[PDB]
From Swiss-Prot:
GO cellular component terms, A-Z: extracellular region
Any Gene Ontology biological process: proteolysis
Function as written in the Swiss-Prot or TrEMBL entry: Extracellular zinc metalloprotease.
Sites where the protein binds Ca(2+) 1: 57, 59, 61
Active site: 143, 231
Catalysed reaction, written as an equation: Preferential cleavage: Xaa-|-Leu > Xaa-|-Phe
Main location: secreted
Protein name: Thermolysin
Temperature dependence: Thermostable.
UniProt binding sites for Zn(2+): 142, 146, 166
Keywords for this protein: Calcium, Hydrolase, Metal-binding, Metalloprotease, Protease, Secreted, Signal, Zinc, Zymogen
Cofactor: Ca(2+); Zn(2+)
E.C. no: 3.4.24.27
């Protein structure tokens, strides 16, 4: 769309009010011209055909309940773009300011969200297991990071490489949650999952076993479900990443934490410089050690922590 950049206001899934970047041309559209080549949000109108209609609104105010998921998908995509740019100096997911597109109200009662290789897609949830998925900044950032991985390491979506791909998305979705300072934690999806139950979440990075995911390599899943457990075995890496950041003792191995910022620097370097489509856990560890080495010196504490963390989860 060609029009005048402006700012509108609305309410998100959780009821919070926020300002969003819109474009005016007869209607006000969810098109943010301020970030790279633009952020565009579409209405899939409960269908599965994509992307749907670019989101149009008559008055630049988005307080209808049907508006909520669009407001958040649009807003959280801006935040994530900012995170990447400000913190890692990366322009959009391709490093060249590619437009970011998302569709909301995808299908009926759809309990998931995903990056399809071209854009983001968010279901509204069935109202019991989930509420509209774009209300969780960690979910939004998890999906967008899949775009980043696709353009860089290109980790294939299955077995160990696929688990690494998933872990990368949870790690960065969590870092983004901390960046925005939106009640941050080391849990995944807590804000949109089981609205009826407080205190739970989809996955836990601090204690993956809390939900039955592995927290040690000896406990990995070897079957075929979930593409070979991409969402299961990601727990081993997630745990390693939490330990690198926060420190702790796990299975008798002690790790000194080096904090979130360095965690992000180290994993982003590994991702963009050293990982390849078929990398396995053991390769991830070498990549992570090489990155810390690059960044902090081979005799650094940082390197030492990365080593300890992987030894703690049994990845050699
Ligand atoms: Ca309106
Ligand atoms: Ca949170
Ligand atoms: Ca979270
Ligand atoms: Ca819940
Ligand atoms: Zn994912």
């Amino acid at each position: 769309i060609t029009g005048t950049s402006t700012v509108g206001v609305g309410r998100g899934v959780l009821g919070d009010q926020k300002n969003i970047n819109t474009t005016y041309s007869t209607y006000y559209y969810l098109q943010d011209n301020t970030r790279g080549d633009g952020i565009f949000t579409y209405d899939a109108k409960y269908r599965t055909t994509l992307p749907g209609s670019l989101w149009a609104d008559a008055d630049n105010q988005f307080f209808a309940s049907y508006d909520a998921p669009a407001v958040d998908a649009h807003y959280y995509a801006g935040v994530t773009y900012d995170y990447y740019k400000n913190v890692h100096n990366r322009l959009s997911y391709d490093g060249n300011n590619a437009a970011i597109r998302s569709s909301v109200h995808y299908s009926q009662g759809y309990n998931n969200a995903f990056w399809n290789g071209s854009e983001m897609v968010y279901g509204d949830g069935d109202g019991q297991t989930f509420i509209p998925l774009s209300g969780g900044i960690d979910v939004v950032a998890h999906e967008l990071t899949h775009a980043v991985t696709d353009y860089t390491a290109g980790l294939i979506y299955q077995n160990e490489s696929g688990a690494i791909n998933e872990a990368i998305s949870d790690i960065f979705g969590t870092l983004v949650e901390f960046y925005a300072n939106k009640n941050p934690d080391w849990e995944i999806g807590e804000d949109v999952y089981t609205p009826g139950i407080s205190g739970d979440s989809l996955r836990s990075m601090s204690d993956p076993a809390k939900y039955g995911d592995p927290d040690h390599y000896s406990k990995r899943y070897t079957g075929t479900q979930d593409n070979g457990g991409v969402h299961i075995n990601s727990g081993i890496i997630n745990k390693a990443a939490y330990l690198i950041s926060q420190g702790g003792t796990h299975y008798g191995v002690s790790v000194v934490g080096i904090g979130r910022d360095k965690l992000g620097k180290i994993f982003y370097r590994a991702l963009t410089q050293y990982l390849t489509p078929t990398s396995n856990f053991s390769q991830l560890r070498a990549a992570a050690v090489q990155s810390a080495t690059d960044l902090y010196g081979s005799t650094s504490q940082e390197v030492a922590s990365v080593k300890q963390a992987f030894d703690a989860v049994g990845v050699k």
